[PDB]
Amino acid sequence: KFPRVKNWELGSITYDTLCAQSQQDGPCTPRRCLGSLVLPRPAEQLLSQARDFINQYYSSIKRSGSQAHEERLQEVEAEVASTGTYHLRESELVFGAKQAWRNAPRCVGRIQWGKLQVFDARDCSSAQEMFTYICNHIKYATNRGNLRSAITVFPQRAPGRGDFRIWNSQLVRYAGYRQQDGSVRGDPANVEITELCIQHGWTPGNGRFDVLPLLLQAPDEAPELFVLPPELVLEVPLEHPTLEWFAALGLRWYALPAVSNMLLEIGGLEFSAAPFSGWYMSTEIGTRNLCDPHRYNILEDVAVCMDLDTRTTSSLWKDKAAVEINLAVLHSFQLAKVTIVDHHAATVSFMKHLDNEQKARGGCPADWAWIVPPISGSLTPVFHQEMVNYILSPAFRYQPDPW
Amino acid sequence: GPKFPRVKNWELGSITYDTLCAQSQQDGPCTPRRCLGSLVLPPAEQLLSQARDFINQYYSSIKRSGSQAHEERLQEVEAEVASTGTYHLRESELVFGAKQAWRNAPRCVGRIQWGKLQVFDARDCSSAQEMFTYICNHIKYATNRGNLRSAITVFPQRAPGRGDFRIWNSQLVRYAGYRQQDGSVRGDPANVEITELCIQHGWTPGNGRFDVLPLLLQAPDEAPELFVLPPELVLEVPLEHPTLEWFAALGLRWYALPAVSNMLLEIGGLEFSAAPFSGWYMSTEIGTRNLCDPHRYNILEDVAVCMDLDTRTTSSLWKDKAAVEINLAVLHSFQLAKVTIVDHHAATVSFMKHLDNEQKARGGCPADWAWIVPPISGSLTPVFHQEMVNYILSPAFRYQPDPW
Ligand code: HEM
Ligand code: HEM
Ligand SMILES: Cc1cc(N)nc(C[C@H]2CNC[C@@H]2OCCNCCc2cccc(F)c2)c1
Numbered sequence: 001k002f003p004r005v006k007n008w009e010l011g012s013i014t015y016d017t018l019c020a021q022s023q024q025d026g027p028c029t030p031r032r033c034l035g036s037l038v039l040p041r042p043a044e045q046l047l048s049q050a051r052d053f054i055n056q057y058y059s060s061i062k063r064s065g066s067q068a069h070e071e072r073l074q075e076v077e078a079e080v081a082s083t084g085t086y087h088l089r090e091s092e093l094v095f096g097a098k099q100a101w102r103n104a105p106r107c108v109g110r111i112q113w114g115k116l117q118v119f120d121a122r123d124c125s126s127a128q129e130m131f132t133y134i135c136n137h138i139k140y141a142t143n144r145g146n147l148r149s150a151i152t153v154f155p156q157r158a159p160g161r162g163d164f165r166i167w168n169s170q171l172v173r174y175a176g177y178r179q180q181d182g183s184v185r186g187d188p189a190n191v192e193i194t195e196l197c198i199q200h201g202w203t204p205g206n207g208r209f210d211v212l213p214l215l216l217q218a219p220d221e222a223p224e225l226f227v228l229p230p231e232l233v234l235e236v237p238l239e240h241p242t243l244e245w246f247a248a249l250g251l252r253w254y255a256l257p258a259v260s261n262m263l264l265e266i267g268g269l270e271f272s273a274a275p276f277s278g279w280y281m282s283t284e285i286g287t288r289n290l291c292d293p294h295r296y297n298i299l300e301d302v303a304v305c306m307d308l309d310t311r312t313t314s315s316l317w318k319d320k321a322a323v324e325i326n327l328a329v330l331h332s333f334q335l336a337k338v339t340i341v342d343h344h345a346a347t348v349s350f351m352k353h354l355d356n357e358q359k360a361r362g363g364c365p366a367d368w369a370w371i372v373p374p375i376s377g378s379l380t381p382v383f384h385q386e387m388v389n390y391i392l393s394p395a396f397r398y399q400p401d402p403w
Numbered sequence: 404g405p406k407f408p409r410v411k412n413w414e415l416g417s418i419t420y421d422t423l424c425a426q427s428q429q430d431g432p433c434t435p436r437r438c439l440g441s442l443v444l445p446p447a448e449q450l451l452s453q454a455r456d457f458i459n460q461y462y463s464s465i466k467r468s469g470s471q472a473h474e475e476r477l478q479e480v481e482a483e484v485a486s487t488g489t490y491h492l493r494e495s496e497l498v499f500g501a502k503q504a505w506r507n508a509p510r511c512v513g514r515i516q517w518g519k520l521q522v523f524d525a526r527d528c529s530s531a532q533e534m535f536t537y538i539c540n541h542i543k544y545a546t547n548r549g550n551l552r553s554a555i556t557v558f559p560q561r562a563p564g565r566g567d568f569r570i571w572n573s574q575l576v577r578y579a580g581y582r583q584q585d586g587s588v589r590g591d592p593a594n595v596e597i598t599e600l601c602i603q604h605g606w607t608p609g610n611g612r613f614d615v616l617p618l619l620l621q622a623p624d625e626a627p628e629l630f631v632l633p634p635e636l637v638l639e640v641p642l643e644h645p646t647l648e649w650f651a652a653l654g655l656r657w658y659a660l661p662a663v664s665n666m667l668l669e670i671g672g673l674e675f676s677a678a679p680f681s682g683w684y685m686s687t688e689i690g691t692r693n694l695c696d697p698h699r700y701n702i703l704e705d706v707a708v709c710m711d712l713d714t715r716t717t718s719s720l721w722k723d724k725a726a727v728e729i730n731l732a733v734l735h736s737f738q739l740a741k742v743t744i745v746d747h748h749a750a751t752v753s754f755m756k757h758l759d760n761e762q763k764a765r766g767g768c769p770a771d772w773a774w775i776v777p778p779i780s781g782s783l784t785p786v787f788h789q790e791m792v793n794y795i796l797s798p799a800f801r802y803q804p805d806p807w
């Protein structure tokens with residue numbers, strides 16, 4: 001029942017016992033594995049998730065089974081029985097947010113899980129106020145380049161109404177403009193969201209790196225548009241340690257990776273706007289953002305600058321240009337004094353996290369295909385590490401686009 | 404949407420549904436509670452139903468399902484089982500089944516070539532010495548002086564109460580790994596045990612990093628016998644770099660023929676415990692895994708020092724830079740020597756084409772994403788962006804316990 005987990009570089013073995021705490025099914029069955037898929041295909045239930053989560057909280061502060069634990073369980077029962085829902089205490093919300101990050105199987109940054117600033121924005125009643133919270137979050141998290149993990153939590157979902165939602169997938173994203181010639185200027189991942197901004201009254205730029213405005217939505221209201229003041233949005237010009245021409249490419253990226261469209265689930269309560277940020281691992285920018293063919297797709301441009309032979313796969317021009325771009329990202333961030341981690345350092349620290357979690361919890365849910373970096377996979381220790389993937393709560397989830 | 408897994412390509416935005424998985428009759432390790440896809444290792448009644456299924460596959464493949472010859476073959480199979488407990492394949496059925504087992508292998512990126520496989524029937528083999536003759540013929544044919552050709556040699560199947568035909572070596576060609584007094588390993592550390600078994604069984608060992616191992620071959624109920632491959636049969640490629648002149652001075656080399664020799668071939672309930680198969684290398688197998696794994700030759704640091712990189716800090720990407728050059732050295736050296744090899748870009752491009760072929764022909768293709776994606780430059784290849792469904796179809800190759 002408990003799976004054996006082996007590391008093939010070192011020959012070491014552990015057993016995951018934590019997986020038995022899973023209450024939520026993933027996409028696999030004994031007939032077929034679907035672990036490579038990106039997205040997923042009443043009082044009694046809420047009450048039991050609420051109890052489990054409260055048990056988790058009192059166990060975390062070592063006060064499991066005390067009177068405060070007992071009376072808090074009664075408070076939750078009393079509230080659900082009367083209202084069909086309940087509310088979290090602030091410190092509970094703080095615990096739940098850290099735990100949702102801890103439990104995220106696709107996150108390689110989890111050694112940092114215990115260090116998270118939690119902003120309680122549950123007293124927010126308008127899109128305008130959402131914006132103020134978001135701006136303070138950005139300023140805090142950015143901290144002049146010395147990035148600090150943060151989450152801001154807007155009011156929970158309520159059965160009698162529409163959700164608070166941030167329409168953007170990230171707080172900072174570059175616009176993508178579809179052209180008459182069918183190409184895309186800017187970031188092709190953000191075409192649809194750029195078009196929505198324009199529909200809701202934004203005057204668009206014409207650059208490759210136009211920071212998008214935010215579409216913020218209070219319950220049952222049309223989303224409202226807010227331009228982030230450019231002084232809040234820290235960006236890094238990309239240059240190269242040895243290649244002088246690289247800077248001429250005019251490439252840049254923003255400092256703050258801040259996911260804004262996922263749902264935060266704690267004790268059966270759902271927070272549909274709960275944006276969170278940390279700092280980048282270099283491959284996210286250098287490899288995926290700039291090199292993906294359905295993104296900025298710069299590989300060929302860069303290789304031609306390097307005067308590589310582009311005529312054939314076997315000169316490994318792609319691999320060569322990809323390394324230089326990742327190096328440029330590392331160099332430029334370090335030069336601009338902005339927090340960044342390379343994929344070797346991050347995966348080493350992830351291995352340590354796995355060992356920490358083994359001792360603490362008897363395992364760690366991990367999604368191998370997301371943990372292993374998108375260049376030089378087997379050069380990192382996580383490649384050689386077997387991993388068990390499963391869903392624990394508190395959790396982050398995907399949710400439908402609100403349009 | 405259809406009641407079958409939906410499979411997306413995220414580069415292109417295209418969708419398919421896998422209906423082939425419905426044909427799987429064997430459970431993998433995953434459940435609704437937990438995914439275990441990253442784990443490397445996983446009577447007459449049972450046999451008869453596997454047999455019937457295989458015979459139906461055979462007759463469907465020649466477009467003769469339901470026909471007299473199909474029903475007669477079925478009757479023939481159950482009569483043979485009813486009186487002996489086993490049965491035997493016709494020659495053309497073995498050929499079909501071998502190719503099908505390769506086509507069904509979820510972890511193989513080379514499957515576009517599945518229809519082109521030379522199937523050597525060695526089901527008459529009766530000694531360890533004859534296994535050696537068969538293996539030498541396979542190696543010569545497959546190597547073809549560098550113009551490599553896919554091949555499989557099939558020795559006799561498991562029989563009840565009778566011992567197995569086994570090749571102890573994991574591949575027909577492997578380098579020795581000698582444990583040193585300083586605790587280190589000279590040669591390939593993956594091969595420490597088999598090397599030590601060969602010496603026990605009377606091999607006089609070398610003292611190099613690239614000593615070709617002898618074969619340990621086991622006929623039914625006999626102790627295994629040792630056979631040295633005549634060196635003229637084992638094609639090897641000395642490694643050099645196109646621009647970095649000192650690379651050749653490292654004395655690195657690899658062999659031409661990747662020939663897996665310890666896997667079990669299952670066809671219709673029948674188990675062929677000895678059926679070595681071979682193709683040609685994808686360059687990352689050698690340049691990235693065999694040469695750069697910390698637990699293999701582990702040459703990353705040596706090469707990066709030669710390249711004069713800053714090995715004191717992760718963020719110089721010294722590991723990534725050296726790896727790329729080692730991989731380019733592998734491609735270049737194999738090309739120069741005119742030995743068949745394919746890079747990870749061309750290999751994955753042709754695997755996508757294979758996925759498209761199989762969608763039309765069978766309605767899906769079992770594929771293990773973590774194995775299909777190459778170990779350098781993953782997201783630079785098109786398979787990274789392709790969702791995959793993994794399941795077990797039969798005929799199949801299986802891992803089997805080491806015989807010692
Ligand atoms: C502190 C620095 C952090 C680093 C270096 C980091 C790194 C990463 C990486 C590389 C991924 C895979 C993303 C992709 O390639 O699409 C990821 C995913 C994820 N991270 Fe982290 N992360 C950090 C902080 C955080 C924080 C603060 C949270 C929440 C509080 C978080 C929650 C998540 C979640 C839920 C995912 C999965 C999202 C998805 O499926 O796209 N991470 N992270
Ligand atoms: C024609 C050129 C071929 C290429 C380039 C190729 C490539 C590969 C690669 C890269 C793997 C992943 C293994 C690893 O990295 O450890 C693999 C696995 C596999 N291949 Fe292929 N292959 C070829 C031919 C064949 C042939 C002829 C067969 C058998 C008839 C075959 C059967 C298998 C099987 C059963 C596996 C999974 C077993 C394992 O190694 O774990 N391949 N192949
Ligand atoms: C907090 C944090 C820090 C960090 N360094 N990195 C991250 C991952 C995000 C940024 N770099 C990529 C990830 O973006 C998150 C969104 N995931 C993209 C895949 C996806 C999801 C849902 C629907 C789709 F259609 C597609 C988070």
Ligand SMILES: Cc1cc(N)nc(C[C@H]2CNC[C@@H]2OCCNCCc2cccc(F)c2)c1
Nearest residue numbers: 443513573661662663680681682683684685688
């Ligand atoms: C026929 C063919 C052609 C080709 N290019 N490539 C191949 C795969 C083999 C060679 N390059 C790596 C693979 O070797 C397969 C053996 N390893 C499987 C994993 C494993 C399991 C148990 C214990 C272990 F130590 C390792 C086959």
Ligand SMILES: C[C@H](O)[C@H](O)[C@H]1CNc2nc(N)[nH]c(=O)c2N1
Nearest residue numbers: 036037038369370787788789790
């Ligand atoms: C299809 C496949 O699952 C998809 O391309 C995944 C693979 N691994 C990944 N890993 C990370 N970290 N981020 C990603 O976006 C993806 N994409």
Ligand SMILES: C[C@H](O)[C@H](O)[C@H]1CNc2nc(N)[nH]c(=O)c2N1
Nearest residue numbers: 383384385386441442443773774
């Ligand atoms: C832990 C993980 O399952 C293991 O290291 C796998 C990953 N992917 C692989 N992919 C291939 N092609 N070959 C391998 O040996 C491995 N090793």
Ligand SMILES: [Zn+2]
Nearest residue numbers: 028033433438
């Ligand atoms: Zn699975």
